[PDB]
Design an enzyme around this catalytic site. Structure first.
Site, PDB file in Angstrom:
ATOM      1  N   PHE B 296       0.787  -1.220   0.000  1.00 55.57           N
ATOM      2  CA  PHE B 296       0.000   0.000   0.000  1.00 55.57           C
ATOM      3  C   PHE B 296       0.826   1.280   0.000  1.00 55.57           C
ATOM      4  CE2 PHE B 296       0.750   0.401   4.520  1.00 55.57           C
ATOM      5  CZ  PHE B 296       0.707  -0.879   5.012  1.00 55.57           C
TER       6      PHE B 296
ATOM      7  N   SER E 217      -7.138   3.233   3.932  1.00 55.55           N
ATOM      8  CA  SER E 217      -7.935   2.051   3.520  1.00 55.55           C
ATOM      9  C   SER E 217      -6.970   0.953   3.073  1.00 55.55           C
ATOM     10  CB  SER E 217      -8.903   2.408   2.428  1.00 55.55           C
ATOM     11  OG  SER E 217      -9.747   1.309   2.127  1.00 55.55           O
ATOM     12  N   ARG E 218      -5.971   0.642   3.909  1.00 59.77           N
ATOM     13  CA  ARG E 218      -4.934  -0.382   3.596  1.00 59.77           C
ATOM     14  C   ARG E 218      -5.553  -1.785   3.568  1.00 59.77           C
ATOM     15  NH1 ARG E 218      -3.196   3.702   2.241  1.00 59.77           N
ATOM     16  NH2 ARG E 218      -1.282   4.790   2.861  1.00 59.77           N
ATOM     17  N   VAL E 219      -6.172  -2.112   2.427  1.00 63.71           N
ATOM     18  CA  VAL E 219      -6.905  -3.364   2.057  1.00 63.71           C
ATOM     19  C   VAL E 219      -7.594  -3.094   0.712  1.00 63.71           C
ATOM     20  CG1 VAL E 219      -8.815  -4.927   2.615  1.00 63.71           C
ATOM     21  CG2 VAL E 219      -7.312  -4.121   4.440  1.00 63.71           C
ATOM     22  N   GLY E 220      -7.769  -1.812   0.374  1.00 66.71           N
ATOM     23  CA  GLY E 220      -8.427  -1.372  -0.868  1.00 66.71           C
ATOM     24  C   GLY E 220      -7.452  -1.181  -2.016  1.00 66.71           C
TER      25      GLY E 220
END
Ligand SMILES: Nc1ncnc2c1ncn2[C@@H]1O[C@H](COP(=O)(O)OP(=O)(O)OP(=O)(O)O)[C@@H](O)[C@H]1O
Ligand SMILES: Nc1ncnc2c1ncn2[C@@H]1O[C@H](COP(=O)(O)OP(=O)(O)OP(=O)(O)O)[C@@H](O)[C@H]1O
Ligand SMILES: Nc1ncnc2c1ncn2[C@@H]1O[C@H](COP(=O)(O)OP(=O)(O)O)[C@@H](O)[C@H]1O
Ligand SMILES: [Mg+2]
Ligand SMILES: [Mg+2]
Ligand SMILES: [Mg+2]
Lengths: 351, 395, 177, 277, 351, 105, 70, 52, 52, 52
Positions: B296, E217-220
């Site tokens: 991320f 939103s660390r999963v998006g």
């Protein structure tokens, strides 16, 4: 600054990881160092009470007290964290009763109740499960009596009872420097002095992290080493001036020369009282090295290498002065002009 | 013995003892699972022995992500080659009732203690939120007919935690290296459930929220994360000296923050506005891009050696890097990469091109007509108003 | 004779070759001055531009037609399109005329420049109007000044500068009507 | 702990009005300095239309003056022109010339020894104690006549407006050492003027250069004094905002701690009373 | 900036009247608009749980969802402020059962627990009226388990279990930006992301008032639109640079014409990210506008025109661009060579 | 307050008009419900208000609505304790307010 | 003076005191907000030095000894 | 706070009261000297925020 | 009263630290005004040697 | 802090506009006409919008 006599109770209070167990360990190791140079009526047999710590911490401390050799004078009472709450409750009374043997037989003791706050936590659990009504911070009513009837057993007995003593060193952990907590106010009001350690001076390099303004000892200079007493009141005074000249040193343009001398002298005195852990210095080398800085012999030395300048002063003066300051008990006038001049032929890391 | 973790602030200011207990404190999204995953990735794959992950009261998505990640990475092999696996997962996650979360840390310890005592070898025991054990016992203990202790917890908090934590040790027959993330509730380190867990650990790693809001990741508070290894007879002399020097510079910056706040940097002396610049530089240099955070953030991860971080912080403490800008130090591995990023970031301030070399007009057999491209779109069908009544009426 | 033409425009390039680029060029006081010397104009006939300044006060900026200046050789005059004069002034009275009326300040010594564009610029330190001078202490200081004959060239230069000022302070109060 | 925040609130609450008081003090000082700077700006005009502006000369010895402040609450004034007298003193020395560093102000001698200490020679302070006059400016001009350079350099924040402080350089050429030497353009550009003085052209040029340096130094330390008051007015407006926003954070933290204190004491009373009933 | 996958738990945490409900409403209305343009297998059926709200606001919201046509896909589980506290405690679980219907049978569900803070207030009422011992902010010890038991049911199921998903949007109301409260930090450590809506961006007209530095939103990022994945990288980069230069250059002190460039670039990206209420944008029309604002085609447009110039970009670009970008799902190397060309031929205001 | 609500609800429900119900210091309604909740032995919540704070305010304020017959429009004077807008009685009361008319000296 | 109120004291007093009480109320409310400012009396505006002299004149008028009510 | 200054006895002069500080029991010379000391100390405590 | 009216404003400020009455502060100020001049020639001068 | 001549011309225009906005927000009240004498005025909505 905070001198400790045989028979008083000196609280070590601070936050976590500040020097409390370190100061207690340096006391026990220095009692091992002093026990060989005194006759058998002056030896202090320490007792370490470790309430609520891990067994790995107690194993590190027993390894250290064996490696230094201090185990032959030390008792180690360890009610640890897996042990039941009545054992952590009754561990300091156990260690104090073991130290009362040396108190009651004319010898001297040094009991260190490490984390008396964890004794209070174990007593709180033990009383809440006994359906006794809680109070402030869910502590019982008699948690003042819990610590007072333990600490008042550290006494300097009279000559008709052998004249023995017992010095107590309760260790109290506070939360973010809060001494307005319940147990902290109790054991502050119970004990004689307090060695108040801070974590904002611990990370400024000033280690042992003694907050000098709040650390007092209410025996005063009655049980201070003379010779150390002859420079120590001026040390207190000069650090008191350096503390009230502080919070203005952000103005480096403010060239005064009436405050900058004490602002530099206090920096050298603050750099003077720094010490490595696990290596306690004898009292005669200490008072020689404070006589080195209170007179201005180190005023040429930069503030970043006085921790080496003090070692060079101690290692480059004669080893014949410490022998006669240990015996003569004060800075004699046949010694203050000898070691005025012996601190002139020493070379310094500072120019 | 030291445990080189490849993280800069951890290996420099609070180095992990190989065999000791490790606590990762921090509250509600500061990074104490990303840090524990990067610890798994660095230490666990280069460990040699076994691993035991005991997830106590955390997200089930995280447990599924860890399980699939370890399947894709050979730490866990399924079926016929399962004996080659090197990790046991034990999951009592946050959908379980409070009786199950209060006892799944003990299951993780039992699976680890069989390896330590009987097998007699080194294991790694990662626990995700050992706070959830204490909180689950607080939920249980409210109904067991007890008078509640301080801020609302059970009276037997320290003894339940000591009964759990004292089994996680190295003995003379085996070795458990234990990393435990510890949630602090409402960002309060004085809450009794973290303040009891503080005394049970060798190396402490306090992750703060404000350092994460500064963008610095991992958000380790360098003047609140301590260790029993930061001792010159243990980690050597120059490592200890640069650690104490880094902490002294950061503390001297911390004492200036209110006068920098109201009066600005134009009030300090030259000796103070030097240490403000050096401390802002070593604040950024504690940040590091993680290998497990690259999904991320994009920046690939950096394993930083111990010699690299000791020399790199010795340089910035001496004053060898006073002419580099601040953002050169941001998210770099070692002291070569900050200089490379500085030369690249003063290239990128001079990277100017004239007429921007388009070649975008009239591309001979690259672009079609737009109608040729809409001809390539296959048409989906609209399947008659959700059809929900009939496939419910299949039952 | 022309191997180094310094100036405000050329200072920018030699500055930018060896300065940090963040700073703009250090500005110049000639950039705020509207009237030059080699630039032709600022004459327009009879009323010629004067500039009578002191440090502590600006007393004139406007146009005059005839101005009499207490120079070191005598109270010379400047008309409209004048000869360029670097003129050092003795302590005396300045006379500025715009017509039949005259505004007269007793100046205390300072240069006044006629330029090749017809401007005059009287720059004196202390300029007293004749109606602000006390005409009573003009002799009580002068008697002690002429009586003080010292032994040092510095103090006798001070006494000479005193007495030439006071002697001009005599006739600055007598024949004004 | 709860007593630290309530006392710290009163600390920041009095700081935020102390600095606003000093801000309005700086504004009332700027309001009377604004007429003195406009009375004293005009005397630099005849000399610069007479002597020009020659910064980049072949001076063998030079003297730079940085006109800084005395008090230390200016906020981006004394360190801006410190960088200007750094970069400008990068520019004049291009042939191995001597440059003498002079600075006026307590915040200038503490900010110019950091870069040029062996080149530092003179520091002047206590200049704006009551006011500025031509006496003290002429006196420090004489103290620069104790040196004999080929040219003089002045650095000062010119009060253009209450927001803009343009760091203006004023270059003052020594008369018969450099000024007539820089005017020999197809003859000499100065010979169009007819000397009325008692002695030759060199001596009236000497008196003229002394008076020109004195009046540009007076103008410099009046422009810089007024821009000092303006910069202290601006920097104690930004500081009041910072001590108002920190007070807005500290009141919210105090109210959180107040509510948590009442909830904690209440929960302790309820648990103690329910242990009995 | 904070892209959301199917099977996620995304907390919409903000202050009072900062537009959290508006984000949830636009999500539901956009699912109506997108359900008609997809096959039956990938259609999101929404649930709006209204806990502790006014009955009038739920009545206006049902009016809005019927006048949009969004009530064809929405269930409304309303437990208002007048209803008893076990009903407000139970209504998230009733709504989550009604949406677990759609999750279990291979379909996709969205659920909005509006003000889980009011569900925790209802459960605190239930707990204290049961005479249970309270904790932080007088909450019961299991108020974390209350929310984690509910939010763990929002999942993305496997291929062996149908493949359905349930996406949860818990709403949490903070007090004065106090994001470190008890319930707020409880739900922060349950949900996957965080959508923090600042009040000061809201009161400056910047609506939706997304705190870009704090909302994550660390999963998006693994689960977003591949055109926006490659377009909005420079958007979040330039917005980070805009935030840091509008964190340091706030005083109007120095101008650099490079930090001023990212200042006037972020001042256009921020105006672009504004949105009117109740009018969601299809994702291809979003990424074309974000492309046009980060590739410099909305440069030199004044900072009070981009909310008109973005409508100009959307109206004047050929609709085949949006159809191709929707169908392929990525800005193809042929499509941007179309797209910058067809972006130059746009009648932008001001010019 | 419920008595004033009932006299207003007659005009809304039977007469079918638009009523202005004035509740002087809704905070004193809150603290009176806190007193009668503590007198019944209920364990108080955070800062000292009742556990049923949101439901007591909800049971008052949820009858001030617009029906199909008429409407009650309420003008509630609001006192803020210790000037704390995060205190639970204004934090629970402001969740019902549609407008604030701040009068200033 | 700032924190003491009397919410019937708007016109419930001596009318001869009401002729001067509004001027005393305003002349102190002008002073309480600026007394915190200029503890120094060196560089004061002409509009603030009058308030900082009149407020000190009225404050020392409004004090009195014990057991001697006027 | 006064003990931090080293001053002993650390009596706070702006917090220590008596009923014997009336001018009818000690006289106007003692009362006025004590009130002058209290006035100059309160002036100093009100100027310490500026001189710090 | 003397330090209030200004009768003893010419003494140093630290002469008053730990003294009894207004005479002993005068003697301590005189002791300080001795000992500020004692630190001029107090090192060698055969005054601190090894053979005295 | 500086003066009414210091601000701009259009800022002086907004000072005029706002200072007559602040007067126009005021209104006499019909419940006040018993003890003020001036009659009160029920201002309609469209008149307020068209006036401002
Ligand atoms: N004077 C000193 N010099 C160098 N290091 C020190 C010094 N004093 C303490 N330390 C180090 O700082 C750390 C402080 O641990 P310490 O022994 O103070 O624990 P404590 O505060 O007594 O109790 P706890 O173990 O709960 O923190 C130790 O690692 C110790 O090695
Ligand atoms: N994107 C937007 N653009 C313009 N206005 C908006 C936007 N979002 C919200 N608003 C306005 O904000 C006001 C409050 O919005 P909303 O009802 O969503 O807030 P809320 O978070 O539900 O607050 P509360 O929970 O206190 O009701 C509404 O009047 C709405 O018109
Ligand atoms: N090293 C890192 N680099 C970038 N982001 C990080 C890092 N560590 C944490 N984060 C941020 O923290 C969030 C996850 O926090 P997490 O590790 O789950 O903490 P917790 O377990 O306390 O909630 C991620 O969304 C990410 O944005
Ligand atoms: Mg310890
Ligand atoms: Mg986690
Ligand atoms: Mg809402």
């Amino acid at each position: 600054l905070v001198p400790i006599g045989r028979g008083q109770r000196e609280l070590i209070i601070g936050d976590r990881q500040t020097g409390k167990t370190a100061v207690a360990i340096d006391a026990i190791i220095h009692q091992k160092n002093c026990n060989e140079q005194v006759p058998k009526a002056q030896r202090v047999y320490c007792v370490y009470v470790a309430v609520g710590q891990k067994r790995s911490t107690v194993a590190q401390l027993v390894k250290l007290f064996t490696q230094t050799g201090a185990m032959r004078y030390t008792i180690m009472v360890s009610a640890t964290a897996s042990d039941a709450a009545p054992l952590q409750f009754l561990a300091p009374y156990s260690g104090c009763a073991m130290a009362e043997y040396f108190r009651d037989t004319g010898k001297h003791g040094l009991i260190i109740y490490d984390d008396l706050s964890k004794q209070s936590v174990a007593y709180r659990q033990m009383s809440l499960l006994l359906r006794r009504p809680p109070g402030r911070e869910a502590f019982p009513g008699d948690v003042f009596y819990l610590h007072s009837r333990l600490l008042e057993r550290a006494a300097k007995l009279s000559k008709e009872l052998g004249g023995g003593s017992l010095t107590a060193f309760p260790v109290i952990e506070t939360q973010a420097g809060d001494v307005s907590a319940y147990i902290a106010t109790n054991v502050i009001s119970i004990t004689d002095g307090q060695i108040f350690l801070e974590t904002e001076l611990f990370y400024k390099g000033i280690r042992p992290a003694l907050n000098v303004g709040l650390s007092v000892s209410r025996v005063g200079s009655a049980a201070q080493f003379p010779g150390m007493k002859q420079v120590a009141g001026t040390l207190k005074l000069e650090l008191a001036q350096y503390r009230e000249v502080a919070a203005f040193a952000q103005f480096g343009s403010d060239l005064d020369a009436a405050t900058q001398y004490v602002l530099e002298r206090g920096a050298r005195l603050t750099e003077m009282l720094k010490q490595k852990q696990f290596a306690p210095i004898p009292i005669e080398r200490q008072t020689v090295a404070v006589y080195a800085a209170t007179k201005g012999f180190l005023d040429k030395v930069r503030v970043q290498d006085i921790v080496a300048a003090e070692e060079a002063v101690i290692s480059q003066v004669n080893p014949a002065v410490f022998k006669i300051l240990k015996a003569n008990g004060k800075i004699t006038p046949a010694l203050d002009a000898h070691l005025k001049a012996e601190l002139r032929k020493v070379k310094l890391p500072g120019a | 013995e030291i445990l080189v973790t490849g993280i800069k602030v951890v290996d420099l200011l609070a180095p992990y003892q190989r065999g000791g207990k490790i606590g990762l404190f921090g509250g509600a999204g500061v990074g104490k699972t990303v840090l524990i995953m990067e610890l798994i990735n660095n230490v666990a794959k280069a460990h040699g022995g076994f691993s035991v992950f005991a997830g106590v009261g955390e997200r089930t998505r995280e447990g599924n992500d860890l399980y699939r990640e370890m399947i894709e990475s050979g730490v866990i092999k399924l079926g016929a080659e399962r004996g080659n696996s090197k990790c046991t997962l034990v999951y009592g996650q946050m959908n379980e009732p409070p009786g199950a979360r209060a006892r799944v840390a003990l299951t993780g310890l039992t699976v680890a203690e069989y390896f330590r005592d009987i097998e007699g070898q080194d294991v790694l025991l990662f626990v995700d939120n050992i706070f959830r054990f204490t909180q689950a016992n607080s939920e249980v203990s409210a109904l067991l007919g007890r008078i509640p202790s301080a801020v609302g917890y059970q009276p037997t908090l320290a003894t339940d935690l000591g009964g759990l934590q004292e089994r996680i040790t190295t003995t003379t027959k085996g070795s458990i290296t234990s990393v435990q993330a510890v949630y602090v509730p409402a960002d309060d380190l004085t809450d009794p459930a973290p303040a009891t867990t503080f005394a049970h650990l060798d190396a402490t790693t306090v992750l703060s929220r404000s350092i994460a809001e500064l963008g610095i990741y991992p958000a380790v508070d360098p003047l609140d994360s301590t260790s029993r290894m930061l001792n010159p007879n243990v980690i050597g002399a120059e490592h200890y000296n640069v650690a104490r020097g880094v902490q002294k510079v950061l503390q001297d910056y911390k004492n200036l923050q209110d006068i920098i706040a109201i009066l600005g940097m134009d009030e300090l002396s030259e000796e103070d506005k030097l240490t403000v610049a050096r401390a802002r530089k070593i604040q950024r240099f504690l940040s590091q891009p993680f290998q497990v955070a690259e999904v991320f953030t994009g920046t690939p991860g950096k394993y930083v050696d111990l010699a690299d971080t000791i020399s790199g912080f010795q340089g910035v403490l001496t004053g060898k890097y006073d002419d580099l800008p601040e953002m050169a130090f941001y998210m770099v591995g070692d002291i070569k990469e900050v200089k490379e990023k500085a030369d690249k970031m003063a290239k990128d301030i001079a990277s100017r091109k004239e007429a921007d070399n388009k070649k975008v007009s009239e591309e001979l057999k690259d672009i079609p007509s737009l109608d040729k491209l809409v001809s390539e779109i296959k048409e989906v069908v609209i399947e008659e108003d959700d059809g929900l009544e009939e496939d419910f009426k299949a039952e | 004779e022309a191997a180094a033409p310094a100036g405000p425009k050329e200072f920018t390039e030699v500055w930018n070759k060896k300065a940090p680029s963040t700073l703009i060029v250090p500005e110049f006081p000639s950039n705020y001055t509207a009237v030059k010397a080699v630039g032709e104009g600022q004459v327009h006939g009879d009323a010629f531009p004067v500039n009578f300044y002191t440090p502590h006060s600006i007393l004139s900026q406007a146009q005059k037609d005839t101005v009499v200046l207490p120079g070191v050789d005598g109270y010379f005059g400047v008309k409209a399109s004048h000869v360029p004069t670097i003129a050092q002034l003795k302590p005396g009275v300045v006379e500025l005329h715009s017509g039949a009326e005259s505004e007269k300040f007793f100046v205390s010594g300072g240069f006044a420049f006629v330029h090749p564009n017809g401007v005059t610029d009287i720059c004196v330190l202390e300029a007293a109007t004749l109606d602000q001078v006390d005409p009573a202490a003009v002799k009580s200081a002068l008697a002690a000044a002429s009586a003080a004959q010292p032994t040092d060239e510095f103090e006798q230069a001070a006494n000479r500068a005193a007495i030439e000022l006071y002697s001009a302070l005599e006739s600055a109060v007598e024949a004004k009507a | 702990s709860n007593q630290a925040v309530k006392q710290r609130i009163r600390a920041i609450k009095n700081i935020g009005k102390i600095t606003k008081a000093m801000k309005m003090v700086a504004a009332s000082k700027m309001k009377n300095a604004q007429i003195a700077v406009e009375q004293s700006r005009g005397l630099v005009d005849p000399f610069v239309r007479l002597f020009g502006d020659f910064p980049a000369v072949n001076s063998n010895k030079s003297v730079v003056v940085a006109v800084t402040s005395d008090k230390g609450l200016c906020g981006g004034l004394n360190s801006n022109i410190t960088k200007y007298t750094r970069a400008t003193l990068a520019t004049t020395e291009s042939e191995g010339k001597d440059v003498v560093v002079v600075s006026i102000g307590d915040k200038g001698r503490s900010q110019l020894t950091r870069i040029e200490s062996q080149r530092y020679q003179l520091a002047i302070a206590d200049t704006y104690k009551v006011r500025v006059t031509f006496g003290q400016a002429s006196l420090i001009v004489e103290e620069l006549i104790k040196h004999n350079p080929q040219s003089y350099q002045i650095l000062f924040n010119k009060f253009r407006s209450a927001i803009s402080f343009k760091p203006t350089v004023a270059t003052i050429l020594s008369p018969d050492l450099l000024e007539k030497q820089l005017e020999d353009v197809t003859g000499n550009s100065l010979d169009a003027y007819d000397i009325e003085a008692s002695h030759e052209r060199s001596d009236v040029l000497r008196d003229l250069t002394e008076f020109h340096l004195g009046v540009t130094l007076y103008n410099a330390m009046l422009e810089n004094n007024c821009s000092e008051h303006a910069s202290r007015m601006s920097a104690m407006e930004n500081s009041t905002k910072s001590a108002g926003e920190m007070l807005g954070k500290l009141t919210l933290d105090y109210n959180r701690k107040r509510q948590a204190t009442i909830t904690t004491e209440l929960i302790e009373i309820i648990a103690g009373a329910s242990a009995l009933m």
